[PDB]
Design a protein around this ligand. Sequence first.
Ligand SMILES: CC(C)(COP(=O)(O)OP(=O)(O)OC[C@H]1O[C@@H](n2cnc3c(N)ncnc32)[C@H](O)[C@@H]1OP(=O)(O)O)[C@@H](O)C(=O)NCCC(=O)NCCS
Ligand SMILES: CC(C)(COP(=O)(O)OP(=O)(O)OC[C@H]1O[C@@H](n2cnc3c(N)ncnc32)[C@H](O)[C@@H]1OP(=O)(O)O)[C@@H](O)C(=O)NCCC(=O)NCCS
Ligand SMILES: CC(C)(COP(=O)(O)OP(=O)(O)OC[C@H]1O[C@@H](n2cnc3c(N)ncnc32)[C@H](O)[C@@H]1OP(=O)(O)O)[C@@H](O)C(=O)NCCC(=O)NCCS
Lengths: 78, 537, 537, 537
Amino acid sequence: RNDGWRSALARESDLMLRCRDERRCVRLRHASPSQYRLDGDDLVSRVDGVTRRSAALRRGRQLFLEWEGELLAIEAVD
Amino acid sequence: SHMAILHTQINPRSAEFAANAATMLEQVNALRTLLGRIHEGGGSAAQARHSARGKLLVRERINRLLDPGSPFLELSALAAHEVYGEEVAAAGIVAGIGRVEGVECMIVGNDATVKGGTYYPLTVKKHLRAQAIALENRLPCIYLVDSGGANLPRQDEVFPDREHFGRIFFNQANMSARGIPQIAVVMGSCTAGGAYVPAMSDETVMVREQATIFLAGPPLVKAATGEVVSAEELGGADVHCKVSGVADHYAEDDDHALAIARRCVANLNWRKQGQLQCRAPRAPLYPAEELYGVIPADSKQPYDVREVIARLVDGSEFDEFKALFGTTLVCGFAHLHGYPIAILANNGILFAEAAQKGAHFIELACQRGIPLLFLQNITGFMVGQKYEAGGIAKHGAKLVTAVACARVPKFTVLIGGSFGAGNYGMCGRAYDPRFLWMWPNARIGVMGGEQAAGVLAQVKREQAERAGQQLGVEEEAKIKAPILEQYEHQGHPYYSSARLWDDGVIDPAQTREVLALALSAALNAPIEPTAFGVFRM
Amino acid sequence: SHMAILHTQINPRSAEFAANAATMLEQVNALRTLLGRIHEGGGSAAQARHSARGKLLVRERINRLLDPGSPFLELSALAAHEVYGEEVAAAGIVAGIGRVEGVECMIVGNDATVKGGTYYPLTVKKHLRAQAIALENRLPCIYLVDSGGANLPRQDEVFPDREHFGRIFFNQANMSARGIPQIAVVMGSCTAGGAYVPAMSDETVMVREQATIFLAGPPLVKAATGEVVSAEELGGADVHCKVSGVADHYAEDDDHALAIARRCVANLNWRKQGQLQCRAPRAPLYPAEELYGVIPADSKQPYDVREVIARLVDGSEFDEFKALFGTTLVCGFAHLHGYPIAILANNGILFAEAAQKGAHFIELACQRGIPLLFLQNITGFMVGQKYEAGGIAKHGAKLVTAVACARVPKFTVLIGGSFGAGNYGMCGRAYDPRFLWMWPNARIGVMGGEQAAGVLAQVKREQAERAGQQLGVEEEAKIKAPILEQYEHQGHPYYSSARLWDDGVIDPAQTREVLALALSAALNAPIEPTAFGVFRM
Amino acid sequence: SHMAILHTQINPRSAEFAANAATMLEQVNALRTLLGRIHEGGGSAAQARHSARGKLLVRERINRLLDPGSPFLELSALAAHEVYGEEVAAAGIVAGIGRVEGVECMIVGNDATVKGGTYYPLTVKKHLRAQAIALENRLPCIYLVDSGGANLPRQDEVFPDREHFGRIFFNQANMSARGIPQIAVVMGSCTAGGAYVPAMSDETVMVREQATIFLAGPPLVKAATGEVVSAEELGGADVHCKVSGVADHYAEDDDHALAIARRCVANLNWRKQGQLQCRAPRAPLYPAEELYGVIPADSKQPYDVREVIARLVDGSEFDEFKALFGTTLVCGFAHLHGYPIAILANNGILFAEAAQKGAHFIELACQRGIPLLFLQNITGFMVGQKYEAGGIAKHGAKLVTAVACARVPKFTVLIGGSFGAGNYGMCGRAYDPRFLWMWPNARIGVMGGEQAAGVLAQVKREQAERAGQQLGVEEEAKIKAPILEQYEHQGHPYYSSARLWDDGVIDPAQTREVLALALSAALNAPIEPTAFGVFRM
Ligand SMILES: CC(C)(COP(=O)(O)OP(=O)(O)OC[C@H]1O[C@@H](n2cnc3c(N)ncnc32)[C@H](O)[C@@H]1OP(=O)(O)O)[C@@H](O)C(=O)NCCC(=O)NCCS
Ligand SMILES: CC(C)(COP(=O)(O)OP(=O)(O)OC[C@H]1O[C@@H](n2cnc3c(N)ncnc32)[C@H](O)[C@@H]1OP(=O)(O)O)[C@@H](O)C(=O)NCCC(=O)NCCS
Ligand SMILES: CC(C)(COP(=O)(O)OP(=O)(O)OC[C@H]1O[C@@H](n2cnc3c(N)ncnc32)[C@H](O)[C@@H]1OP(=O)(O)O)[C@@H](O)C(=O)NCCC(=O)NCCS
């Protein structure tokens, strides 16, 4: 279970990603296990009572996320 | 199996409930907040002065090296809390268990920011307790070396004795012999002592223009027959990768270095040796946070432990052995996240019957190679005159041999009080449980505060009575004053976990989560048959 | 074999000789008379108040128990010397090896006279270190029980942790399972803790109207649910011999008790397990007392170690391996009182050559199952810019993998200096030598006195230099002066031996006789085949 | 793991590439066509006079017995090439491994067409080399018996000695005892010698009116106490299936006989005991064809080995150990068709650090139970005065110890030059690699052509020098001429595979797939733990 589980603090997951042409080391520290879950090719977001589902799915070392019309791709830094 | 079910008796909405739950969740928040303080390291101060040098911080090196999003079970974080004069966060060394290329691994790295990463007494004890867990459960090891030396001022508790530094190398080469890979990544200085950590390791990695492995750094080397040389020329990264051979992989920086290490763990051709009849993982039947309010707030207040069990086992299914006999000790089989486990939890005192019941259980557990789970909340054995003439002695001994001799993986969690003989009969620190943990509410002591201030002041007035007088409430009260408070302080989780008397303090509501992680991780190594000593019947 | 002979090069009549021998024998007589002090126990005072009870004194019970005229190898006599506030002779427990019914046995009895026999932290470390020597060397056990409980004021370092009390019971039940008889003779009070020592032992003996085994003595039992009862009614000698069953033999008193004990060791069907090809024992070629003058008096004065070798081996015959290579470490085969031994004695510094030389040698003996003997007189590894870039690091490391892994009996004697990495590469405390001893002229520390003051004060003026300052002759002389002496004191044999970092300080002149005894004793247990870790070539 | 990739530096379109790739491909076609000639057996001549008797030809029998389209790895096909006076096709015995009822089997059959199927010295050598691969990799054996006797004229090298005929029976009864089924299919004469192959075999099959198993055929039997009897009556198919019991299955003809055979392998209850952490197979990143041009045409012309590596490993991912140290030898981990492997490939000379590098690698490999892959292209050990004084002698020794003792599966392939000490330090024929192969371009010999003529002739004028004379360029040149040509002749693959110094010459661009077949096949046998000898430090 890659939930970033930790002893007493909150789930920690440090991700060295890269979308477009700008890399970012994402720090994922959620104490409230919610936020974004995802089944099939779809990312569901519980944005304060107002749930919305944006398409996203991965292929190889690349993950496509339809963000605002655009269909950007994100991959891992090496 | 709709009968091996545990139907709760607790009302989650009850006032008394939220009562206990109140101060329980409060203690947990006390821990949550200190731990955070401990992640500070040598403090924002030098912590920044660290990233200055282009060096990733220790806890970061850790998260970069772990599998994407993998869990991480930390080890004694409260290490050396308020122990030495100064503040040496998590003892200047972080270490724990996490996935690296799909292998449950033991990771240990020093905090260059904490008093120069030098080895304080408890640092050495911590570093060794990591290699126990690693040898005991067969987990490959990655040491992220970046330390000064040994804390010179307190060398007498760091250098000599068996249990001191240097047993670090002993354990290392033994593990390497037992086939438990030994990897090293030097990301800083590594003078004298720590110089062997990289030299004695199957595979070794160095960051160029950062790492340095030399037996005697420039300070000590100029102190030799003169000679004045730089650190990188003395024992640099380039010296030990192209010339000497004390290193094996030439890293460009901390990030490279860590990804280089992953790859070594990658071709380990590693396979787990443990082996139980684990079954489909099914969750509890009651939210595991309900616990916060299950444990009373009045330390000396009785509660039914079967309540804490129903919130940990799978489907709160628990078949009880010797159901109604020596009830002060609850015994039963269950499964936890698939893995089948034999539980032993305290329900009060501990008369002779509870020990016989407990011994006979361990026997069953040991014969079927089912792992052991001890839930400590014992106050001691029932005293008295017919109780002693009844063998409470010998019988309590029967439970102790059984525990000490039991060779399947054992696990203890302190959920109440570890006091006296109890701590030993229930798999305490000294009986080598794979891992042993503590709740924020539990207290450990040789005996209660006044209980010991009782005897201690007592004989003081008996040696002074068969001497022609007695102890007046004046001097007797001044003899119990100190004890009463000393005990209240040396019984608290922080005081314990600081000295590694346990592998840490945990969130009562995460208990189950830790246990599964632990279990799984100890299956990296084989469940051995068990051989008992002689049982004094 | 008239060539394997070591012809001496020292003159017993020289003045420089009587010089060293003088100051040497002065040190031995210093130890001699300290030891006599410690054989006093809790001072004539209490000691006599002891015999008053009709109780045989500790050291007496022992000599009574041993076989007529047998030898006795005491362990850590200087135990807890000037360690605790008050005096605690031999840490309230005497322990050692002696023949009982023709079996080399490990014996431990506490000194009820010393602070009521209670267990001070070091008393525990001792009791434990004794059972290690017992496990590792397969010696049956005789526990001559007569203690209060655990020194209550200092419980925090006597109850909890892994190797604290309770680890006693652990070791016992295990040894009982590995077939190493565990006997117990209770000759006094035995409340709470030590209540298990007899409860958990194959055979048990009590003295009537004197022994008492109860989990809670009456101080504790009255503070329980009221009730007031006597000691002998609660858990006397007759309660546990006719009613409970916590004991097995009803002894009339101390003399009887020990005789009952002798008889148990009588029907142990015991057989030794080791096995070497020892030959007829032939004495040295030069009086063993001549050593006194062999050792220079000036600690930093170079001398030839073969001269000490010549006085310990049989017929002073010594076959030298890699005779003229890395001469800094002398290695060779010989015999000692029959038994064949492979020797490793320091002779100076220790550059790479010496380590490879020593690792290759350990290989040879480990392959023939010949015991290893290390003679420490090491100042450290050769520092330098070139010596470092040449692998003095990875080469010193091959030596320790070798030492750490060796599974034949390992034996260590400190006859010079144990400093730094040296101590480890030469089987120091941490490498499990079956026994580790110290000469009175030898000193041990992580590094020399001023050598540590050198660097610890050095960085102080490099942190304060890249800080726009410098440390003046007045602040750097005040950072070094306390360290300069701290080391001088924490380097002395008593300092060492008081903390059990060795199994005692010995008489240079009896080295050979001790080693003879130890070896044989270590042969009650099999010589294991050895498995090496990875060698960093 | 996009870091462990080998990005090529070879341009497949370059002219120089096309040049190498040219004479390389020619070499291969050279082999191609010879191997065809050898397929003819004793030549169309009697080969057709075979089918005459209604007997299926050798290689035909094999394809019928194999599984529908199963692959077949043939062994030493160039067997006995230009060795004996006459032409003795593949030494008159075809052997190889192939799938038979889902089991990797060792198959051996005689070519009745080649000089009456009799055993020439090498027929025996090939036969026995097969039973080796068979015992060493636990592959059940299938003997397709169809041989005359042993070649009467050259019996001196075919009957007596240890590894001569009759050792076939030795390996056989031992294989049946170590539980490796021994199946026999008799499809021709089988007089005297080979009469035991079917007599000593778990299960045996005979072809009626064609098979004949007798100790002395009618020639010999008449030469006995007279008596004249026919083949069919003395020891025919019906005699040993219905009368004696030397055979078990009565087959109606060659096709039936093999079908019966298949069935036996079918009721084997066989299970593989190898065990690796094989991962899913992923093809290389460069056509394995491109190898033809990576290998220079100019024999002693420097190229980078990692290039050949990148075209055989899975996904051309290769993690290199001691990356930049004694680079003369490249060492790394990778996978091949799933199976993980540890590689050691030459890249030049071979200084001291190269062997310490390689010996250290073999320890890590042997510590994880990963197969070893050696790629030879070694010209020898760097000589010199400082070089020799530096231990290039003892360190070289370090390597060979490791290689000679490594017990995991070893695989060798000659892709350059096997010359001198090199061949041994890289698992040459004598170190029992499970399989040893040779590329068309590679040459093997104790040392270069003129190198040997160098010394060999040098001494002649050193003994003739201190003999008052000198070697005139006329005699010296006649001393070296014969050598310079001898060496060139016995350095060639055909000469080598002809005498079984290797299990065959292969197609460089087929290597990858041969290794996969082998590795998998050797997993029929458990990867045993390794025990190293003494390492000369
Ligand atoms: C480790 C070292 C490189 C520090 O490098 P750095 O990153 O610049 O860190 P600093 O020099 O600023 O060290 C700061 C702290 O380290 C402490 N320190 C470093 N080494 C120490 C040691 N061996 N003993 C005690 N304290 C030490 C200093 O007391 C200082 O404390 P302060 O911050 O309260 O003033 C340097 O101290 C060194 O060379 N030490 C060698 C240690 C040694 O030789 N030990 C051998 C014993 S086995
Ligand atoms: C052990 C005992 C029988 C002593 O009998 P005794 O031969 O008469 O000896 P005394 O009672 O005179 O004891 C004298 C010393 O023992 C020391 N002592 C005894 N038990 C002690 C304990 N548990 N902790 C600390 N000190 C203890 C006292 O400090 C006293 O010191 P002092 O001489 O400086 O004043 C008595 O102290 C007793 O009943 N103790 C029980 C111990 C116990 O219950 N411990 C449980 C913890 S595991
Ligand atoms: C084997 C045998 C049945 C051949 O039957 P076949 O199919 O008719 O074959 P042929 O008789 O035509 O033999 C042809 C070749 O076999 C060779 N040959 C057969 N047995 C041979 C032997 N033992 N030694 C040497 N050559 C032999 C002949 O040299 C002949 O060579 P050629 O073709 O170049 O002229 C017959 O040779 C025979 O009975 N041999 C007995 C072998 C024996 O007794 N060996 C005991 C030693 S283990």
